[PDB]
Short mmCIF file of all heavy atoms in Angstrom, two decimals:
data_model
loop_
_atom_site.label_atom_id
_atom_site.label_comp_id
_atom_site.label_asym_id
_atom_site.label_seq_id
_atom_site.Cartn_x
_atom_site.Cartn_y
_atom_site.Cartn_z
N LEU U 50 62.56 117.15 93.41
CA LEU U 50 63.75 116.60 94.06
C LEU U 50 64.61 117.76 94.53
O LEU U 50 64.49 118.88 94.03
CB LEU U 50 64.54 115.75 93.06
CG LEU U 50 63.72 114.64 92.37
CD1 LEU U 50 63.24 115.07 90.98
CD2 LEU U 50 64.53 113.36 92.26
N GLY U 51 65.49 117.48 95.49
CA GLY U 51 66.44 118.47 95.97
C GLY U 51 65.81 119.60 96.75
O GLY U 51 66.43 120.67 96.89
N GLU U 52 64.61 119.37 97.29
CA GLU U 52 63.88 120.39 98.06
C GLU U 52 64.35 120.46 99.51
O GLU U 52 64.63 119.43 100.14
CB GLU U 52 62.37 120.13 98.07
CG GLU U 52 61.68 120.38 96.74
CD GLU U 52 61.40 121.86 96.49
OE1 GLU U 52 62.08 122.73 97.09
OE2 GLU U 52 60.50 122.16 95.69
N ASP U 53 64.43 121.68 100.03
CA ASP U 53 64.34 121.87 101.46
C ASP U 53 63.12 122.74 101.75
O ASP U 53 62.08 122.21 102.15
CB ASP U 53 65.62 122.44 102.08
CG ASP U 53 65.55 122.47 103.59
OD1 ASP U 53 65.03 121.50 104.19
OD2 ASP U 53 66.00 123.46 104.17
N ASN U 54 63.23 124.05 101.53
CA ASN U 54 62.08 124.93 101.66
C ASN U 54 61.21 124.73 100.43
O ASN U 54 61.56 125.22 99.37
CB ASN U 54 62.51 126.41 101.79
CG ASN U 54 61.33 127.32 102.12
OD1 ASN U 54 60.20 127.08 101.69
ND2 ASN U 54 61.58 128.37 102.92
N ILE U 55 60.08 124.04 100.58
CA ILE U 55 59.19 123.79 99.43
C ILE U 55 58.43 125.01 98.89
O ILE U 55 57.77 124.91 97.86
CB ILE U 55 58.17 122.63 99.67
CG1 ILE U 55 57.37 122.81 100.95
CG2 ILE U 55 58.89 121.29 99.66
CD1 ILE U 55 56.07 122.04 100.97
N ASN U 56 58.51 126.14 99.58
CA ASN U 56 57.85 127.37 99.14
C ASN U 56 58.80 128.44 98.58
O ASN U 56 58.34 129.50 98.20
CB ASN U 56 57.04 127.93 100.32
CG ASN U 56 55.94 126.98 100.74
OD1 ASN U 56 55.23 126.47 99.89
ND2 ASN U 56 55.82 126.71 102.03
N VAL U 57 60.11 128.15 98.54
CA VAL U 57 61.11 129.08 98.02
C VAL U 57 61.99 128.31 97.06
O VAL U 57 62.45 127.22 97.39
CB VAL U 57 62.01 129.64 99.15
CG1 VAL U 57 63.12 130.52 98.55
CG2 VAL U 57 61.19 130.42 100.18
N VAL U 58 62.25 128.88 95.89
CA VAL U 58 63.23 128.34 94.95
C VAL U 58 64.62 128.71 95.49
O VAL U 58 65.03 129.87 95.44
CB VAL U 58 63.02 128.87 93.52
CG1 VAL U 58 64.12 128.37 92.59
CG2 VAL U 58 61.64 128.44 93.01
N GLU U 59 65.32 127.72 96.04
CA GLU U 59 66.61 127.95 96.71
C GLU U 59 67.84 127.66 95.87
O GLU U 59 68.91 128.15 96.21
CB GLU U 59 66.68 127.13 98.00
CG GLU U 59 65.77 127.66 99.08
CD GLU U 59 65.88 126.85 100.35
OE1 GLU U 59 65.49 125.66 100.36
OE2 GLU U 59 66.36 127.42 101.35
N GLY U 60 67.68 126.90 94.79
CA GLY U 60 68.80 126.28 94.08
C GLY U 60 68.77 124.84 94.55
O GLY U 60 68.22 124.55 95.61
N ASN U 61 69.35 123.94 93.76
CA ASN U 61 69.26 122.48 94.01
C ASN U 61 67.95 121.76 93.63
O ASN U 61 67.97 120.54 93.57
CB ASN U 61 69.64 122.09 95.46
CG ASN U 61 70.99 122.62 95.85
OD1 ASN U 61 71.11 123.42 96.79
ND2 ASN U 61 72.01 122.22 95.11
N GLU U 62 66.85 122.47 93.38
CA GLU U 62 65.59 121.79 93.01
C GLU U 62 65.70 121.22 91.60
O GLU U 62 66.32 121.83 90.72
CB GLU U 62 64.39 122.73 93.01
CG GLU U 62 63.97 123.29 94.36
CD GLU U 62 64.67 124.57 94.73
OE1 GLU U 62 65.62 124.97 94.05
OE2 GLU U 62 64.27 125.18 95.75
N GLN U 63 65.09 120.05 91.39
CA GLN U 63 64.78 119.58 90.05
C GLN U 63 63.31 119.19 90.06
O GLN U 63 62.91 118.38 90.90
CB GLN U 63 65.66 118.39 89.64
CG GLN U 63 67.16 118.67 89.63
CD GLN U 63 67.99 117.40 89.43
OE1 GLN U 63 67.66 116.56 88.58
NE2 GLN U 63 69.08 117.25 90.21
N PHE U 64 62.52 119.81 89.18
CA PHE U 64 61.10 119.51 89.02
C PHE U 64 60.97 118.66 87.76
O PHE U 64 61.33 119.11 86.67
CB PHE U 64 60.27 120.78 88.83
CG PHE U 64 60.25 121.73 90.02
CD1 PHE U 64 59.61 122.96 89.89
CD2 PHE U 64 60.81 121.39 91.27
CE1 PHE U 64 59.55 123.85 90.94
CE2 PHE U 64 60.75 122.29 92.33
CZ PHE U 64 60.12 123.51 92.16
N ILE U 65 60.45 117.43 87.92
CA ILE U 65 60.32 116.49 86.82
C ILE U 65 58.93 115.86 86.87
O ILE U 65 58.51 115.33 87.91
CB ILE U 65 61.39 115.38 86.89
CG1 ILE U 65 62.81 115.97 86.97
CG2 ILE U 65 61.28 114.45 85.69
CD1 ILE U 65 63.90 114.95 87.22
N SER U 66 58.22 115.90 85.75
CA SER U 66 56.88 115.32 85.68
C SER U 66 56.95 113.79 85.77
O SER U 66 57.89 113.17 85.26
CB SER U 66 56.18 115.74 84.39
OG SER U 66 55.98 117.13 84.39
N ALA U 67 55.97 113.20 86.45
CA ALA U 67 55.79 111.75 86.40
C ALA U 67 55.33 111.37 85.00
O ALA U 67 54.39 111.98 84.47
CB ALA U 67 54.77 111.31 87.42
N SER U 68 56.00 110.41 84.37
CA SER U 68 55.50 109.84 83.12
C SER U 68 54.65 108.60 83.37
O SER U 68 53.82 108.25 82.55
CB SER U 68 56.66 109.47 82.20
OG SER U 68 57.54 108.58 82.86
N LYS U 69 54.89 107.90 84.48
CA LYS U 69 54.11 106.72 84.85
C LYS U 69 53.90 106.72 86.35
O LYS U 69 54.82 107.05 87.08
CB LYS U 69 54.85 105.44 84.48
CG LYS U 69 55.15 105.30 83.01
CD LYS U 69 55.88 104.01 82.73
CE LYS U 69 56.08 103.84 81.23
NZ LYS U 69 56.71 102.53 80.95
N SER U 70 52.68 106.38 86.77
CA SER U 70 52.36 106.18 88.18
C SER U 70 51.68 104.82 88.37
O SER U 70 50.52 104.62 87.97
CB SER U 70 51.51 107.32 88.69
OG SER U 70 52.27 108.52 88.70
N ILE U 71 52.42 103.89 88.96
CA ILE U 71 52.04 102.50 88.99
C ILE U 71 51.69 102.04 90.41
O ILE U 71 52.58 101.77 91.23
CB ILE U 71 53.17 101.62 88.40
CG1 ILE U 71 53.53 102.09 86.98
CG2 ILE U 71 52.76 100.14 88.42
CD1 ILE U 71 54.67 101.31 86.34
N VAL U 72 50.39 101.95 90.69
CA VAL U 72 49.87 101.45 91.98
C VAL U 72 50.00 99.92 92.00
O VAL U 72 49.75 99.25 90.99
CB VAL U 72 48.38 101.84 92.17
CG1 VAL U 72 47.77 101.21 93.41
CG2 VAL U 72 48.22 103.36 92.23
N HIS U 73 50.39 99.36 93.14
CA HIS U 73 50.42 97.90 93.29
C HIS U 73 49.05 97.32 92.90
O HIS U 73 48.03 97.82 93.40
CB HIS U 73 50.78 97.49 94.71
CG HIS U 73 51.29 96.09 94.83
ND1 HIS U 73 50.45 95.00 94.88
CD2 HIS U 73 52.55 95.60 94.93
CE1 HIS U 73 51.17 93.89 94.99
NE2 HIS U 73 52.45 94.23 95.02
N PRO U 74 49.01 96.31 92.00
CA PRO U 74 47.76 95.66 91.59
C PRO U 74 46.87 95.14 92.72
O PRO U 74 45.67 95.05 92.53
CB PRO U 74 48.24 94.47 90.77
CG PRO U 74 49.46 94.99 90.12
CD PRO U 74 50.13 95.81 91.18
N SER U 75 47.47 94.75 93.85
CA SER U 75 46.73 94.24 95.00
C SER U 75 46.51 95.30 96.09
O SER U 75 46.06 94.97 97.17
CB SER U 75 47.45 93.01 95.57
OG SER U 75 47.38 91.93 94.64
N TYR U 76 46.81 96.57 95.79
CA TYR U 76 46.46 97.67 96.70
C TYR U 76 44.97 97.66 97.07
O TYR U 76 44.12 97.57 96.21
CB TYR U 76 46.81 99.02 96.08
CG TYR U 76 46.27 100.21 96.86
CD1 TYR U 76 46.67 100.42 98.17
CD2 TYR U 76 45.35 101.10 96.29
CE1 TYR U 76 46.18 101.49 98.90
CE2 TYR U 76 44.86 102.18 97.00
CZ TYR U 76 45.29 102.37 98.31
OH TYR U 76 44.83 103.42 99.07
N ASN U 77 44.68 97.75 98.36
CA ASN U 77 43.31 97.82 98.83
C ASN U 77 43.14 99.15 99.56
O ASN U 77 43.79 99.37 100.59
CB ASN U 77 43.01 96.64 99.76
CG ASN U 77 41.58 96.66 100.28
OD1 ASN U 77 41.15 97.63 100.90
ND2 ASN U 77 40.84 95.58 100.05
N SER U 78 42.28 100.01 99.02
CA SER U 78 42.11 101.37 99.54
C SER U 78 41.35 101.47 100.87
O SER U 78 41.37 102.53 101.48
CB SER U 78 41.46 102.28 98.48
OG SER U 78 40.15 101.88 98.16
N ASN U 79 40.71 100.40 101.32
CA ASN U 79 40.06 100.39 102.63
C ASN U 79 41.06 99.98 103.71
O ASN U 79 41.22 100.71 104.70
CB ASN U 79 38.83 99.47 102.64
CG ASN U 79 37.68 100.03 101.80
OD1 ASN U 79 37.52 101.25 101.67
ND2 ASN U 79 36.86 99.14 101.24
N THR U 80 41.75 98.86 103.50
CA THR U 80 42.72 98.34 104.49
C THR U 80 44.10 98.96 104.39
O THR U 80 44.90 98.82 105.31
CB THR U 80 42.90 96.81 104.38
OG1 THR U 80 43.40 96.47 103.08
CG2 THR U 80 41.57 96.09 104.63
N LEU U 81 44.38 99.60 103.26
CA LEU U 81 45.73 100.05 102.89
C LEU U 81 46.79 98.94 102.80
O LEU U 81 47.97 99.23 102.81
CB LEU U 81 46.20 101.25 103.74
CG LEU U 81 45.40 102.56 103.60
CD1 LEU U 81 46.29 103.75 103.89
CD2 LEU U 81 44.76 102.77 102.24
N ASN U 82 46.36 97.70 102.62
CA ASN U 82 47.29 96.62 102.34
C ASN U 82 47.89 96.81 100.94
O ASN U 82 47.17 97.16 100.01
CB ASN U 82 46.60 95.27 102.44
CG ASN U 82 47.59 94.12 102.47
OD1 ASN U 82 48.68 94.25 103.01
ND2 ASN U 82 47.21 93.00 101.88
N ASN U 83 49.21 96.59 100.83
CA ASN U 83 49.97 96.89 99.61
C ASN U 83 49.95 98.38 99.22
O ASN U 83 49.75 98.73 98.04
CB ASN U 83 49.50 96.02 98.43
CG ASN U 83 49.54 94.55 98.75
OD1 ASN U 83 50.60 94.03 99.12
ND2 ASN U 83 48.41 93.86 98.61
N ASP U 84 50.19 99.24 100.21
CA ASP U 84 50.18 100.67 100.00
C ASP U 84 51.54 101.12 99.45
O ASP U 84 52.34 101.71 100.14
CB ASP U 84 49.81 101.42 101.30
CG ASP U 84 49.47 102.90 101.07
OD1 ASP U 84 49.28 103.31 99.90
OD2 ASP U 84 49.39 103.64 102.08
N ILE U 85 51.76 100.82 98.17
CA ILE U 85 53.01 101.12 97.48
C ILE U 85 52.72 101.51 96.03
O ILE U 85 51.84 100.93 95.39
CB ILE U 85 54.02 99.95 97.57
CG1 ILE U 85 55.35 100.32 96.88
CG2 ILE U 85 53.48 98.66 96.95
CD1 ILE U 85 56.50 99.39 97.28
N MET U 86 53.46 102.49 95.53
CA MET U 86 53.33 102.99 94.16
C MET U 86 54.72 103.30 93.64
O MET U 86 55.55 103.80 94.39
CB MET U 86 52.47 104.25 94.13
CG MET U 86 52.39 104.97 92.80
SD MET U 86 51.26 106.38 92.86
CE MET U 86 52.08 107.51 93.96
N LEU U 87 54.95 103.02 92.36
CA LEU U 87 56.18 103.39 91.67
C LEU U 87 55.89 104.51 90.68
O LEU U 87 54.98 104.41 89.88
CB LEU U 87 56.79 102.18 90.96
CG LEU U 87 57.50 101.20 91.88
CD1 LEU U 87 57.80 99.89 91.16
CD2 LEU U 87 58.79 101.81 92.43
#
C-alpha cells in the first residue's frame, strides 16, 4: 500500500502479508466470469 515508485522505498509504503485470499466460488478460469477475489 502507499506505493508510487514500486522499485524505490520512498516513504509512505506499508507492506502487509495477505492472511486470506478468497476467490469467488463461481469463478471460471476459462471465461473469467466472476473474476473477483478478496
